[PDB]
Write a structure and sequence with these properties.
The structure is cut from a larger assembly and holds three copies of chain A, one copy of chain B (1160 residues), two copies of chain D and one copy of chain G (90 residues).
Chain A lengths: L1 E2 L3 E2 L6 E2 L12 H10 L2 H8 L6 H12 L11 H11 L3 E4 L4
Chain D lengths: L1 H5 L33 H17 L5 H10 L10 H5 L7 H13 L5 H6 L1
Chain G lengths: L5 H6 L3 H16 L14 H11 L4 H18 L1 H8 L4
The structure holds magnesium ion (MG) and zinc ion (ZN) (2 copies).
The site of magnesium ion has 3 residues of chain B, from loops.
Function (chain G): Promotes RNA polymerase (RNAP) assembly. Latches the N- and C-terminal regions of the beta' subunit thereby facilitating its interaction with the beta and alpha subunits.
Catalytic activity (chain G): RNA(n) + a ribonucleoside 5'-triphosphate = RNA(n+1) + diphosphate
Family (chain G): Belongs to the RNA polymerase subunit omega family.
């Protein structure tokens, strides 16, 4: 199996397929151990955001790829943005203050 | 003059209670109807859980009705229906609220282990707080007569008390009552009076509850939250998209359970509001209020009390909390079955054409439109979709120096993901270098690996300079090489040595390379003879460089040609003069330590190519006649069955103890099993005769099977012994041993009986394999959970103290030395010399300089070395104190990640640990880390004194020992059970043995010393690795022991409050800043405390980190009560938020941003 | 989108109010059809091929 | 058919949190793909399309670029008709349609928008 | 497990100290469980279903 | 006493956390889904001190608690009901008469009737 | 340097700082003012930057300084526009 970019679930903007392509490979805890040990900060960086579940990020970075610019331009993955609202949906309040 | 009011960069996140007005701030409207979607138009209702006016528009830019359509009105709301026409993702972020009539209690702050709302108020949970808010027993709210302030009254008691006084102590019941209770509570005045009363003439009979609540009460008031927010009056609503009802296939919608919940809470709430306007029968309204309570509690967190069912599913409903309580798929990915690729290099891998085509799709597109070919972007897609020849060449361009990193399923350590340079291969399978095939623990049984494409620019450089296989020559666990040649190649180089006498031999001498012409051109053999040739050696010394040394040595044909592969330096010839076994790797290691990376890397490709080729040339096979049985087999078996026969006859005529004759006859067969095993080995080993010149001589068998065993290549004694010898004593499901060992062997036939016996061994073998394989990872998770936050920082501090390293000696009564445990170790300070001078202060023991520690003779067997156990560092680890041991040869690069690499190496060999005064196995490793007291703990002398009995069994009691000397006594308690070891009157030292049994690490650390307890843990945990025979460096054990001793307990008087057990992090940093601040008397002396992996990991600064592993419902709750904030340095919590890792490639980023957050 | 409206205007509109959802053989595989089959709804215009 | 449509309203219906293949662990709502989002490929091409049109109207005259731009309404939101464009350019209706057709005549050799079609 | 009745072992450490504590169990084909077990103090208890 | 002594002395530490043990050694109506989480929370995690927070914290249903208050029967007969109904009509009549006492209620009704005939 | 990259860490310790600086340089090539120092020979900018570090030119301080001169070139040369805007709001 191999996947560049395909569909995503409504609930969590994560790659999935089987209707035309194949849902991309799964990372996980065992692998994020390894990356942290090496010191692959940007690889783990992308592998947690733009490469996976960053709505604007993946589109922004894909355009940068076809333009041959690379870089990244990341953002809060919805797999954490959802948590803010689900926690905020409860009587508890979490706010991400600046400095 | 900043004060920006946008979504910029954040340095921390805060967690606290939300005021009803706090909830109102998020409110983009009020849900008022349980209605979801229309039954006919399938359109969002007015003010339902899915409003368009409240939350967001369905379609992207067109409003609900349709008055406005295109981008003309993206900022203005509709006229007929207040629908802000922006995006549809707005529907994914908008909040919204419901405003209840009577107050409702938050399920979390109510019933979550400690009742927060209760303990804050000092009141029973499921006892009093339940009967008081479920409308059962009314509570008081402060009275100036007869009644106290928080007593519980019945209806009868209520009216009686009301009739006596009344109209001046009014005290309601239910939810709003607890509100007035929490509201009326003065945290300030109570924090004073609680401090006054709970300090007046009370020993340790009160201090418990005293210290606890006063710390808690002080926390909450300072947190900023008002206890009013505990029970909410305004409950906020989750954004619609995060709980949608999307039409599947041909009708049949699919919704989340929250819609069921939110719909119930609204219905119950409105009926409540409607009843608070109609006739209000106390029983009817109160019940509806309890039902709103049920509804809200179920929506927030089911848990817990029955579980609200409905939804037709016999299964419960997924509430909010259950959706955040307890994997990460990714784009640009793929996987396939792996296959060996001998023709590859060490930094290369076979990546399939069609696979790589779809993987670099975004790169191929860009390069196509870049060059020409494709007029536009969509032209490229149609161009690669129609794989048009030219496209493949462009593909050959984009994957040029674009590293792709590989990954296997069970990733135990760092070498699970390694980078390679993509090589196009016409096939649908992924090929891999046969050297790094061992690091992955991968076989070609059908195992399949995954591939990832480093998109980011530096993500490519991270892959090339770190995760690239060529940088991972050595194992992170033990300094030895990891890509060392395995089975096929090693038998290859073993066949390239192995001096055979004569047989097309003779000593016809030449000069290296010319011999190659000799081998191909036949005439001469290859394993002869020996024979002499000219060896041009190269060595260096002092001023390095190279010093030639031509000579005439007696090698073989194999050793001559094989010499060509060897690099410039090295001792030469002598490395080839031996053979191919374990030194095959030894040769590789030494080359790395004396040459460097590149010479070693190319050397590996060469030694790999050599082995395969010559091994293929050799053609060692395994016919049925290769595994020869000894002739004395039937002889030895009869003799053993003769001996056991005599024993059974003795048991028949009494004589010998029949109760344990089972044990002694087992020894007979066990001796018998060894006799056949030795006989088979001595025969199959040497044998042969040859015929040298005048014939008659002996070497060692060229029996293929033997060659494989005498050269690694999966061939051990036990397996061989089963091949031709015999399968010895077999286990019985009971755990006992059968008294009739499998006399036969695999070379011979096997009876149906003895196979049905051996079937048990295999079953319990595979099964036990299945348990310890998952139990291994179960350990690694705990190791990492506690250790994955510390990284080598502040460069290299001062300090000289550190454990005195000495050779692990069981030689006290068994003789077993190991003295390589100091290398790449930084010296403590000039560790003497039988005379003077020698070793420096911070000089790290080189690989060549530890070999210099043999020139100082066997006299010097003790050296103080800086370790992670010590090191007066603060929140990190000194580089010097660590070492160097990596795949890299130097000291660890500043800002590495010691923790994870440490844990990985420790929990990696867990796969090869057998679970069970010797427990032994993986479980033994666990207990040492958990720091658990033994089932029969020994006892130690806290203070050195004179031993005497303290009232023979006068309690209670049970014996009593009292070592008193100099000043003050001690009364230890002996429970009669178990003897003693020191008579009365005798004197003891500070921590002497008076139980001669298992030692408790807690006592050792507490009394003996930190160096002692760490030395105990390391030398005891290693002892279970010796038996399993798995090499693993002591550093990493020390690393986990480091933060295994993270916190301590202060005992005196300081700015820190006594009984509190706090970590030496804040402790040391605060005691250093008090000696020279105002006075050292405003600070106390602390005391190191041993806590296990779990107990240590349980404590951590980030509340986000904790919510990862431990019970989220608890951690998020308690961290909410006090206005806590993560800010924001941990690894784990900085991963889920999805930003740069505060270490490695990052680190620099965090340091800059860490210092940046000093202005305010 | 305006640009697309222009684009079809330059090459011919034919902007059918219909989409596309034809069963296509997934990329990679390839073989020969050995049997087709059609189960029509009870009350639906049966096809020529059906 | 009335009865048929009635059965399309029955049942709650199903909730997403339902286990399906009984993996580790399945949920029906986890298979639900998003369709309101566009493929990054599709988004990239739309941008390149903007560049394509923005560059093709450059090889045109002002009294032809503005004509093509304003008629089919591009880079100006509200699109106008033959009259509202015929009034701002004196000559009404047929004259402006003449130019509008001439611009379309020009785009019969460039391949950019051709392949962008499909 | 076959219907009927059988006396189970439960041998070994079940409350430290180590002392048997035998127990019987009746397993119906279509019905409720009927247990009988001892305790450290040698009392007799029953678990219905 | 009973629960406290039995729980503590037994659990030391029950090794593999023998849950199915002391839960039978507890009073009241069993087989509940409420008392469950209150034992899984204390045993591990915050050991030693958690076991002292438990007893001090130990020193239910909507419908069952509803029938409880409804338990106060106070049922009626044909005599009882009609009595209550008589008091209802009695209360109502006094209200209307009290309303009839109000002249502006008549005059407003008069004013609003002329509004009705004026359509 | 398509096989270590080890010769580069020698010129600047800490393989991590190496990745940061080489990527910095590699970013300079891939987009913007290219101008490599070592001959390309058909190598990606990923490795071209590394070839330079190994060669001995282009380090961390080197890049920062050339950025300083770059700013002094963009700013000081085109100040006639800035000062013109400075008199805008007086
Ligand atoms: Mg395998
Ligand atoms: Zn509208
Ligand atoms: Zn240090």
């Amino acid at each position: 199996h191999a996947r560049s970019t395909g569909s995503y679930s409504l609930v969590t903007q994560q790659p999935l397929g089987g209707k035309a392509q194949f849902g991309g490979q799964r990372f996980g805890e065992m692998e994020v151990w390894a990356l942290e040990a090496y010191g692959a900060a940007y690889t783990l960086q992308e592998m947690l955001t733009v490469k996976s579940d960053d709505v604007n990020g993946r589109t922004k970075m894909y355009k940068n790829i076809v333009d041959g610019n690379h870089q990244m331009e990341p953002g809060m993955p919805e797999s954490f943005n959802v948590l803010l609202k689900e926690i905020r949906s409860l009587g508890i309040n979490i706010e991400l203050e600046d400095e | 003059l900043k004060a920006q009011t946008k979504t910029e960069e954040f340095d921390a996140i805060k967690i606290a209670l939300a005021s009803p007005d706090m909830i109102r701030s998020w409110s983009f409207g009020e849900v008022k109807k349980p209605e979801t979607i229309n039954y006919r138009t399938f359109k969002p209702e007015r003010d339902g859980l899915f409003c368009a006016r409240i939350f967001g528009p369905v379609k992207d830019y067109e409003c609900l009705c349709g008055k406005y359509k295109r981008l003309k009105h993206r900022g203005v709301i509709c006229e007929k229906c207040g629908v802000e026409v922006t995006q549809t993702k707005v529907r994914r972020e908008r909040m919204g609220h419901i405003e209840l009539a009577s107050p409702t209690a938050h399920i979390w702050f109510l019933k979550s282990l400690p009742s927060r709302i209760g303990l804050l108020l000092d009141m029973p949970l499921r006892d009093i707080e339940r009967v008081l808010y479920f409308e059962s027993y009314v509570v008081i709210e402060g009275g100036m007569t007869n009644l106290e302030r928080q007593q519980i009254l019945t209806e009868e008691q209520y009216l009686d008390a009301l009739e006596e006084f009344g109209d001046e102590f009014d005290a309601k019941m239910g939810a709003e009552a607890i509100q007035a209770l929490l509201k009326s509570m003065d945290l300030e005045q109570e924090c004073e009076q609680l401090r006054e009363e709970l300090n007046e003439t009370n020993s340790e009979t009160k201090r418990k509850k005293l210290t606890k609540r006063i710390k808690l009460l002080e926390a909450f008031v300072q947190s900023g939250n008002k206890p009013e927010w505990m029970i909410l009056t305004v409950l906020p609503v989750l954004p619609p998209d995060l709980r949608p009802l999307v039409p599947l296939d041909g009708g049949r919608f699919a919704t989340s359970d929250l819609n069921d919940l939110y719909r119930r809470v609204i219905n119950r709430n409105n009926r409540l509001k409607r009843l608070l306007d109609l006739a209000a029968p106390d029983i009817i309204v109160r019940n509806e209020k309890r039902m709103l309570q049920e509804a809200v509690d179920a929506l927030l967190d089911n848990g817990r009390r029955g579980r609200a069912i409905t939804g037709s599913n016999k299964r419960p409903l997924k509430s909010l909390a259950d959706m955040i309580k307890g994997g990460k798929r990714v784009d640009y990915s793929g996987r396939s079955v792996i296959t060996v690729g001998p023709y590859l290099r060490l930094h290369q891998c076979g990546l399939p054409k069609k696979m790589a085509l779809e993987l670099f799709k975004p790169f191929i597109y860009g390069k196509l439109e870049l060059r020409g070919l494709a007029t536009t972007i969509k032209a490229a897609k149609k161009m690669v979709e129609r794989e048009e020849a030219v496209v493949w060449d462009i593909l050959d361009e984009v994957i040029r120096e674009h590293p792709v990193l590989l990954n296997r399923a069970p990733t135990l350590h760092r070498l699970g993901i390694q980078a390679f340079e993509p090589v196009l291969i016409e096939g649908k399978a992924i090929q891999l270098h046969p050297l790094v095939c061992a690091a992955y623990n991968a076989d070609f049984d059908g195992d399949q690996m995954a591939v990832h494409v480093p998109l980011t620019l530096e993500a490519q450089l991270e892959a090339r300079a770190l995760m690239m296989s060529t940088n991972n020559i050595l194992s992170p666990a033990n300094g030895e090489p990891i890509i060392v040649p395995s089975q096929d190649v090693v038998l290859g180089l073993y066949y390239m040595t192995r001096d055979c006498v004569n047989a097309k031999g003779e000593g016809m001498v030449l000069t290296g390379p010319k011999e190659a012409e000799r081998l191909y051109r036949s005439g001469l053999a290859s394993l002869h003879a020996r024979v002499k040739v000219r060896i041009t050696e190269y060595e260096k010394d002092a001023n390095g460089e190279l010093v030639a040394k031509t000579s005439l040595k007696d090698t073989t044909v194999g050793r001559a040609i094989l010499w060509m592969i060897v690099p410039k330096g090295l001792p030469y010839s002598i490395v080839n003069q031996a053979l191919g076994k374990k030194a095959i790797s030894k040769m590789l290691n030494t080359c790395y330590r004396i040459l460097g990376l590149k010479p070693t890397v190319i050397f590996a490709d060469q030694i790999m190519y050599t082995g395969f080729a010559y091994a293929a040339r050799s053609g060692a096979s395994v016919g049925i006649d290769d595994m020869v049985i000894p002739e004395k087999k039937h002889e030895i078996i009869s003799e053993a069955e003769a001996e056991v026969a005599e024993i059974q006859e003795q048991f028949q005529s009494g004589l010998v103890t029949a109760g344990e004759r089972y044990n002694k006859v087992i020894d007979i067969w066990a001796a018998a099993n060894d006799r056949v095993s030795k006989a088979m080995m001595d025969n199959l080993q040497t044998e042969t005769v040859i015929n040298r010149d005048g014939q008659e001589e002996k070497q060692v068998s060229f029996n293929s099977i033997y060659m494989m065993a005498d050269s690694g290549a999966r061939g051990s004694a036990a397996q061989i012994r089963q091949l031709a010898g015999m399968r010895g004593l077999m286990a019985k499901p009971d755990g006992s041993i059968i008294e009739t060992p499998i006399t036969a062997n695999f070379r011979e036939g096997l009876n149906v009986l003895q196979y049905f016996i051996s079937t048990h061994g295999a079953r319990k073998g595979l099964a036990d394999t299945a348990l310890k394989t998952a139990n291994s990872g179960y350990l690694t998770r705990r190791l990492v959970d506690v250790a994955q936050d510390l990284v080598v920082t502040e460069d290299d501090c001062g300090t000289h103290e550190g454990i005195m390293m000495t050779p692990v000696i069981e030689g006290g009564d068994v003789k077993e030395p190991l003295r390589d445990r100091v290398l790449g170790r930084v010296t403590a300070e000039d560790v003497l010399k039988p005379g003077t001078a020698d070793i420096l202060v911070p000089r790290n023991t080189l690989l060549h300089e530890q070999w210099c520690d043999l020139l100082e003779e066997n006299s010097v067997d003790a050296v103080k070395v800086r370790s992670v156990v010590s090191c007066d560092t603060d929140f990190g680890v000194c580089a010097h104190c660590y070492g160097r041991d990596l795949a890299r040869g130097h000291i660890i690069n500043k800002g590495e990640a010691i923790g994870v690499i440490a844990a990985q190496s420790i929990g990696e060999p867990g796969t090869q640990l057998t679970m069970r005064d010797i427990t032994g196995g993986l479980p033994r490793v666990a207990d040492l880390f958990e720091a658990r007291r033994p089932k029969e703990p020994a006892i130690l002398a806290e203070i050195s004194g004179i031993v005497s009995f303290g009232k023979e069994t006068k309690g209670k009691r049970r014996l009593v020992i009292t070592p008193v000397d100099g000043s003050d006594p001690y009364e230890e308690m002996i429970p009669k059970w178990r003897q003693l070891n020191v008579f009365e009157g005798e004197r003891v030292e500070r921590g002497d043995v008076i139980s001669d049994g298992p030692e408790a690490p807690h006592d050792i650390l507490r009394l003996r010393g930190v160096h002692a307890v760490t030395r105990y843990i390391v030398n005891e945990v290693q002892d279970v690795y010796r038996l399993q025979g798995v090499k693993i460096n002591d550093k990493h054990i020390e690393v986990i022991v480091r933060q295994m001793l993270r916190k301590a307990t202060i005992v005196n008087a300081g700015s820190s409050d006594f009984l509190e057990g706090e970590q030496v992090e804040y402790s040391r940093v605060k005691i250093a800043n008090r000696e020279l601040e105002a006075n050292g008397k405003v600070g106390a002396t602390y005391s190191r405390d041993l806590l296990g992996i779990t107990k240590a990991s349980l404590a951590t600064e980030s509340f986000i980190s904790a919510a990862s592993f431990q019970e989220t419902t608890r951690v998020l709750t308690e961290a909410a009560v006090a206005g806590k904030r993560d800010e924001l340095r941990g690894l784990k919590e900085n991963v889920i938020v999805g930003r740069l890792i505060p270490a490695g490639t990052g680190y620099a980023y965090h340091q800059d941003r860490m210092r940046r957050r000093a202005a305010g | 989108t305006p640009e697309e409206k222009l684009l079809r205007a330059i090459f011919g509109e034919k902007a059918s109010d219909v989409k596309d959802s034809s069963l296509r053989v997934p990329n990679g595989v390839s073989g020969t059809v050995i049997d087709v089959q059609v189960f029509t709804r009870d009350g639906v215009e049966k096809d020529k091929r059906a | 058919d009335k009865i048929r449509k009635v059965l399309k309203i029955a049942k709650e219906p199903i909730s997403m949190e339902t286990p399906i293949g009984d993996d580790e662990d399945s949920h029906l709502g986890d298979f639900i793909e998003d369709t309101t989002l566009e493929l990054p490929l599709d988004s990239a091409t739309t941008e390149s399309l903007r560049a394509a049109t923005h560059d093709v109207l450059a090889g045109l005259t002002a009294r032809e670029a503005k004509v093509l731009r304003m008629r089919f309404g591009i880079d100006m939101n509200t699109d106008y008709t033959l009259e509202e464009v015929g009034k701002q350019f004196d000559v009404t209706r047929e004259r402006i349609r003449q130019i509008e057709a001439k611009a379309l005549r020009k785009l019969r050799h460039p391949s950019r928008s051709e392949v962008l079609r499909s | 497990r076959s219907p009927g009745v059988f006396f189970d072992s439960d041998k070994g450490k079940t409350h430290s100290s180590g002392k048997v504590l035998y127990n019987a169990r009746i397993i119906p084909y279509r019905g409720s469980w009927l247990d009988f077990e001892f305790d450290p103090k040698d009392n007799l208890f029953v678990r219905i279903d | 006493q009973s629960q406290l002594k039995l729980l503590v002395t037994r659990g030391k530490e029950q090794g593999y956390l023998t849950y199915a043990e002391v839960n039978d050694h507890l009073p009241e109506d069993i087989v509940d889904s409420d008392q469950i989480e209150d034992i899984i929370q204390m045993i591990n995690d915050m050991g030693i001190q958690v076991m002292e927070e438990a007893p001090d914290a130990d020193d239910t249903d909507p419908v069952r608690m509803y029938m409880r208050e409804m338990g106060t029967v106070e049922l009626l007969t044909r005599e009882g009901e009609i009595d209550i109904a008589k008091r209802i009509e009695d209360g109502i009549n006094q209200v209307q008469c009290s309303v009839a006492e109000y002249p502006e209620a008549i005059t407003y009704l008069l004013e609003q009737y002329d509004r009705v005939e004026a359509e | 340097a398509r096989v270590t990259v080890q010769d580069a860490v020698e010129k600047i310790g800490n393989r991590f700082d190496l990745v940061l600086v080489a990527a910095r340089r590699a970013r300079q090539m891939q987009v913007g003012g290219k101008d490599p120092l070592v001959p390309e020979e058909n190598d990606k900018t990923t490795v071209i930057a590394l070839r330079e570090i190994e060669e001995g030119l282009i380090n961390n301080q080197i890049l920062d300084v050339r950025e300083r001169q770059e700013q002094q070139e963009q700013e000081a040369a085109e100040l006639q526009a800035v000062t013109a805007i400075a008199e805008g709001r007086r």
